[PDB]
Amino acid sequence: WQTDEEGVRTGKCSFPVKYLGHVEVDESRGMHICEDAVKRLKAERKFFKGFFGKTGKKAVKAVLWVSADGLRVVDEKTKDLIVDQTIEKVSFCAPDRNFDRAFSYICRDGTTRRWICHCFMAVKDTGERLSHAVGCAFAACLERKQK
C-alpha cells in the first residue's frame, strides 16, 4: 500500500467505483453514521426503480481519484468531472462493517451549513483499501499545512 501513498502525492491514485450519491448526516464522524447513510441511499435506489425501473436513481459508473489536494469523481461514460471535493473540508472517512465493497466520507457543506455523507461502492476493490488511500491523502494534506 506504499505505492498507494506515493500515488496520492503524485495524482496517480485511482479506483473504479459506483458513485451512490450524497445524504445529510447529523455528525462529522461516526463509523455508524456512515453505515446509515449507505443504508439510506441503498434504500432510495430501491424506492425509485419500484416506479421508474432500472433508470433511477441509478448509481453512476465512475473513477475516484485521490490526491493530497482533493478527491475527484469522473464519469466513465462522459469523462465529465462529477465530484470535486476539497480535501480540507472533509471531516471523516470509512469503510463499511456490513457492506464489504462500500466506502464513504463525511464533509462540510458551508452554504447549506450541514454535514454531507458521500457513499461509493468499489468495483474491483475492498472498501478498506479505498479508505486507506484517502487516509494517505489526509496525511499528505496535514503534513503540508505549515504553521
Binding site: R29, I87, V90, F92, C93, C107, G135, F138, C141, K145
Partner: peptide, 7 residues
C-alpha cells in the same frame, strides 16, 4: 477511520 483534516 480515518479522521479528516477539517477545522
Amino acid at each position: 477511520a480515518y479522521i479528516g483534516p477539517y477545522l
